[PDB]
mmCIF file with all atom_site columns, C-alpha atoms in Angstrom:
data_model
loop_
_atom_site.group_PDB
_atom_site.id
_atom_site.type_symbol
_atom_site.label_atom_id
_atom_site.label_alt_id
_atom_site.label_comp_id
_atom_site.label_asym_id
_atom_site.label_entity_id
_atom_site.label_seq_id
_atom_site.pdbx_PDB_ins_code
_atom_site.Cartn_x
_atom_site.Cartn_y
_atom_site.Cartn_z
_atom_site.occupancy
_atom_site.B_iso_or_equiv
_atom_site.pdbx_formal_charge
_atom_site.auth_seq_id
_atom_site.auth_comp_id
_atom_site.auth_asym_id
_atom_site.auth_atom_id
_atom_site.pdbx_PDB_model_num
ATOM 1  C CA . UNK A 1 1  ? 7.660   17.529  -11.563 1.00 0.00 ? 1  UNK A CA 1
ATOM 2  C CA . UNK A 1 2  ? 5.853   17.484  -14.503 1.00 0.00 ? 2  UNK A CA 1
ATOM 3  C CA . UNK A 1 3  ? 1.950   18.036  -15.476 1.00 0.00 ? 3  UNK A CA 1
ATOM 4  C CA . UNK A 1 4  ? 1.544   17.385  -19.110 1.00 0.00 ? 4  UNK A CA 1
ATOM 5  C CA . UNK A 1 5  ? -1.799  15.883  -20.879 1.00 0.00 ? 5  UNK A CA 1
ATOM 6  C CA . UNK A 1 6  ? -1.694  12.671  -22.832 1.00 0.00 ? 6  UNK A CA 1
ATOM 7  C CA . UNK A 1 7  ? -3.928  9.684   -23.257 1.00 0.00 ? 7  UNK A CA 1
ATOM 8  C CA . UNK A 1 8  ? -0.383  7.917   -22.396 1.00 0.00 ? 8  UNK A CA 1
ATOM 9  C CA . UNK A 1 9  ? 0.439   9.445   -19.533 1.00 0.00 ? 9  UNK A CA 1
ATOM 10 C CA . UNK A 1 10 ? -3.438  9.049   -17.782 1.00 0.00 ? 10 UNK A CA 1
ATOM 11 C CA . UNK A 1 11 ? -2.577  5.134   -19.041 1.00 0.00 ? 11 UNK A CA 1
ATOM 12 C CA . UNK A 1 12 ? 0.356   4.748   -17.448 1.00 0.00 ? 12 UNK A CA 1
ATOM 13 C CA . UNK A 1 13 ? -0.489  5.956   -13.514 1.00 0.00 ? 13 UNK A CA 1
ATOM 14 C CA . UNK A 1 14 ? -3.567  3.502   -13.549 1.00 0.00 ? 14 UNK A CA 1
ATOM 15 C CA . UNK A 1 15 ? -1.439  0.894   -15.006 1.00 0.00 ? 15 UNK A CA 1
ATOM 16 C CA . UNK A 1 16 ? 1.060   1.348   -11.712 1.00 0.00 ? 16 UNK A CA 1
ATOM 17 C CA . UNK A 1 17 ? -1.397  2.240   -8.892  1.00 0.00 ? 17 UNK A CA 1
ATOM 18 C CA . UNK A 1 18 ? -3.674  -0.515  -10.362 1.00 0.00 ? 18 UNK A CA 1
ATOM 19 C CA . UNK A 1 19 ? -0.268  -3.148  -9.880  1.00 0.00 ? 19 UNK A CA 1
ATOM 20 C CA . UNK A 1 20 ? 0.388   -1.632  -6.326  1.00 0.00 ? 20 UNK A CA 1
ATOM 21 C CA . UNK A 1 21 ? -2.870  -2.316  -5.098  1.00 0.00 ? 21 UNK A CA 1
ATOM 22 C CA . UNK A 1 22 ? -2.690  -5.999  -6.015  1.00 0.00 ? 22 UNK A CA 1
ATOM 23 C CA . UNK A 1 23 ? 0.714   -6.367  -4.738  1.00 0.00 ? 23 UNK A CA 1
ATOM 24 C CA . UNK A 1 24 ? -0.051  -4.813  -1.692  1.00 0.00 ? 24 UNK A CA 1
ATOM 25 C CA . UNK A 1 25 ? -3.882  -6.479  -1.357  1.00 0.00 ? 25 UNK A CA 1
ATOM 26 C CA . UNK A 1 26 ? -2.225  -9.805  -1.348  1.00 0.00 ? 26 UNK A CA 1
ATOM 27 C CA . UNK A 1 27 ? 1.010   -9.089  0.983   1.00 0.00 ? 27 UNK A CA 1
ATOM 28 C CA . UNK A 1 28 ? -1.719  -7.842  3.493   1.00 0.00 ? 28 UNK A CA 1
ATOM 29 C CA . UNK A 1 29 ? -4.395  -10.076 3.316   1.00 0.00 ? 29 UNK A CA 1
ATOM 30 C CA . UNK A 1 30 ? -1.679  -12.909 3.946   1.00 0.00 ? 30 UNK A CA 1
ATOM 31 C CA . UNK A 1 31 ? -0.523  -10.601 7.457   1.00 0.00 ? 31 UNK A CA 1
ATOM 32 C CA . UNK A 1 32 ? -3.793  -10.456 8.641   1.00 0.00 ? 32 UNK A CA 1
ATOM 33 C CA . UNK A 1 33 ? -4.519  -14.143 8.247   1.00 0.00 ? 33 UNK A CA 1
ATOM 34 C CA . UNK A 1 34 ? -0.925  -14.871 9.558   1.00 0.00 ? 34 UNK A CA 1
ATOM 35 C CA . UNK A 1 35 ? -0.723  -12.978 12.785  1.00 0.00 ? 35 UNK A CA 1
ATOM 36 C CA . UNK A 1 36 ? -4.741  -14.656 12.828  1.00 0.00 ? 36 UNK A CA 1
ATOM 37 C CA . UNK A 1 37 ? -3.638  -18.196 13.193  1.00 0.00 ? 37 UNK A CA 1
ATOM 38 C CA . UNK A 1 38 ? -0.705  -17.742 14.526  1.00 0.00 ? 38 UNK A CA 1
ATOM 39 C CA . UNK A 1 39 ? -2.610  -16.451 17.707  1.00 0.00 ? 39 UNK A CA 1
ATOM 40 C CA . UNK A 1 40 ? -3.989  -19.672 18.178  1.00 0.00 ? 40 UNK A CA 1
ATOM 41 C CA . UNK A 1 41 ? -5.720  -18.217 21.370  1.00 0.00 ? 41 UNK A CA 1
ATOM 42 C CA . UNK A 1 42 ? -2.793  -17.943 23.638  1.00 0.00 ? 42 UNK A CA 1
ATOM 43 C CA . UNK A 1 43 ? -1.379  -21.482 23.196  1.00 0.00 ? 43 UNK A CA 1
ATOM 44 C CA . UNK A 1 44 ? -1.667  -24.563 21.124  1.00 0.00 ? 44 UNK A CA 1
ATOM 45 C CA . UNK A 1 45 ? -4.846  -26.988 22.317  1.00 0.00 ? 45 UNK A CA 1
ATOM 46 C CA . UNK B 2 1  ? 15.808  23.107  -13.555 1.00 0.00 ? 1  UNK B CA 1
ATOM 47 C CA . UNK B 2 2  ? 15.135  21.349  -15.974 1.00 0.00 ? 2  UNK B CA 1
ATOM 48 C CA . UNK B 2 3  ? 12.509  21.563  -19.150 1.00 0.00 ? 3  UNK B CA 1
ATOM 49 C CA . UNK B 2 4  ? 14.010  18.397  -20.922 1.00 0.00 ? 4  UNK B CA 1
ATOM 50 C CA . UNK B 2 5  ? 12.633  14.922  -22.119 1.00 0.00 ? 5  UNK B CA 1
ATOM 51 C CA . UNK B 2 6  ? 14.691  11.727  -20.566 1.00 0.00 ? 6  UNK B CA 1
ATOM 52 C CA . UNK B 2 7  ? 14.238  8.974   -18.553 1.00 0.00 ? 7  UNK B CA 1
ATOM 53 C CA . UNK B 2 8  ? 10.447  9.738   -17.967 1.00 0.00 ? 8  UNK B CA 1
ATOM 54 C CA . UNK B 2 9  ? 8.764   7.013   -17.973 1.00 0.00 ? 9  UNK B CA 1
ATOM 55 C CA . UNK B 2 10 ? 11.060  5.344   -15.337 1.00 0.00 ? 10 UNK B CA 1
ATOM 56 C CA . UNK B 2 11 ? 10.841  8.243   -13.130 1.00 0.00 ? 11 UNK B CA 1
ATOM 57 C CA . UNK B 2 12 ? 7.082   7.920   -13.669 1.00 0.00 ? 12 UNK B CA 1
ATOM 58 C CA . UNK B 2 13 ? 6.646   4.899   -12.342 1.00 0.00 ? 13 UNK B CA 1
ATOM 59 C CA . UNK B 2 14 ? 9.001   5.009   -9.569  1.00 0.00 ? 14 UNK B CA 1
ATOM 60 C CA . UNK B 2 15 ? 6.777   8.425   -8.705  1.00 0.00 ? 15 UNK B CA 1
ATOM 61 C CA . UNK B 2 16 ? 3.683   6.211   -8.596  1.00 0.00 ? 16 UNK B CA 1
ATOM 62 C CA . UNK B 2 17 ? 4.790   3.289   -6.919  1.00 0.00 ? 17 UNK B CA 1
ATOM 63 C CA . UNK B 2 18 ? 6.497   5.267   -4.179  1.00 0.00 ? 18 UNK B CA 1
ATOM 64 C CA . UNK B 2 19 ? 2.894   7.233   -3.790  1.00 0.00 ? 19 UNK B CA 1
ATOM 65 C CA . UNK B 2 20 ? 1.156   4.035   -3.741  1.00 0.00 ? 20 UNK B CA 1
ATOM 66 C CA . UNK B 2 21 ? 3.381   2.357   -1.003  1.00 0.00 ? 21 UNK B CA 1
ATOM 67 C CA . UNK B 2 22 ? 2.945   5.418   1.361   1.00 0.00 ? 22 UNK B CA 1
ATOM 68 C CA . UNK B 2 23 ? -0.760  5.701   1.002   1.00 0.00 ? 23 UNK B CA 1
ATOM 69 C CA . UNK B 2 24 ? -1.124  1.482   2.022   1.00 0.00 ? 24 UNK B CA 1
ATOM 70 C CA . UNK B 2 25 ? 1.387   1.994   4.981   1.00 0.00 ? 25 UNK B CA 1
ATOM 71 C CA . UNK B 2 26 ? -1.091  4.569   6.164   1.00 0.00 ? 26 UNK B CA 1
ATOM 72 C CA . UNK B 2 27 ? -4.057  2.750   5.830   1.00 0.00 ? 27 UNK B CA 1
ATOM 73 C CA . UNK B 2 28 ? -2.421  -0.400  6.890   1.00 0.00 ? 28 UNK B CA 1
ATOM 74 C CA . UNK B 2 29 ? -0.885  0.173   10.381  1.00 0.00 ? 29 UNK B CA 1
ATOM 75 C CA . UNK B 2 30 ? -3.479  2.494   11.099  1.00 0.00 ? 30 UNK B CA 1
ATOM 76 C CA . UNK B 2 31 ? -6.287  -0.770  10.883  1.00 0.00 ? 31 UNK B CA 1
ATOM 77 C CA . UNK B 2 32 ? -3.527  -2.693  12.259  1.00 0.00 ? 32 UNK B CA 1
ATOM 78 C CA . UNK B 2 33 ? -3.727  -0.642  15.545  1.00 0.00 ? 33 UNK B CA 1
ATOM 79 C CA . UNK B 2 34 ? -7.321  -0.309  15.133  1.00 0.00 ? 34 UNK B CA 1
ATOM 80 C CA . UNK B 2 35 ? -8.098  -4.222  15.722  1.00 0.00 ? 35 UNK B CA 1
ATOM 81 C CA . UNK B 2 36 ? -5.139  -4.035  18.305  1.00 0.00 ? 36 UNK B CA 1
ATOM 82 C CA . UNK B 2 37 ? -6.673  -1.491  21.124  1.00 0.00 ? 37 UNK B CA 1
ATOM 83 C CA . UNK B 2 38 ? -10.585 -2.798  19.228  1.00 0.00 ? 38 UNK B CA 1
ATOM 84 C CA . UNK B 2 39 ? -9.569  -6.259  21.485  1.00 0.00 ? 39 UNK B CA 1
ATOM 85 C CA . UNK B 2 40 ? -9.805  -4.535  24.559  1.00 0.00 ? 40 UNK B CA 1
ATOM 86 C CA . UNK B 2 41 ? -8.562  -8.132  25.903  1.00 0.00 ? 41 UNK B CA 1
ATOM 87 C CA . UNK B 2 42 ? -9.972  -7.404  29.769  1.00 0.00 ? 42 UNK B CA 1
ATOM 88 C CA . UNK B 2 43 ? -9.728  -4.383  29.749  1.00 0.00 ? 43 UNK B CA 1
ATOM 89 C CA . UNK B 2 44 ? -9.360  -0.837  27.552  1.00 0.00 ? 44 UNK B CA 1
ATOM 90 C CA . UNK B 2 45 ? -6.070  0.434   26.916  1.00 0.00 ? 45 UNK B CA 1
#
């Protein structure tokens, strides 16, 4: 699209990928412990 | 095309966050299906 220079525009990306990493960190982190449990080696005991 | 200032910043950040979402889906199902076959439960599949 466009690949302009600005102390802004560097700013700005690591503002966003920064906030989709911790959005996604957490929705994951919750899956994995989820599917974990819910496991519960075959059936409840 | 188009050599014009507009609407940048939004279509900044939806340009990020869309990046950002692909790369985690990739590294995501890919560990899911690592731990999946990893299991071996009796035997390797």
């Amino acid at each position: 699209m466009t690949d302009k220079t600005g102390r802004e525009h560097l700013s700005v990306y690591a503002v966003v990928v920064i906030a989709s990493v911790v959005g996604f960190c957490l929705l994951v982190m919750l899956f994995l412990l989820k599917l974990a449990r819910h496991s519960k080696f075959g059936m409840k005991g």
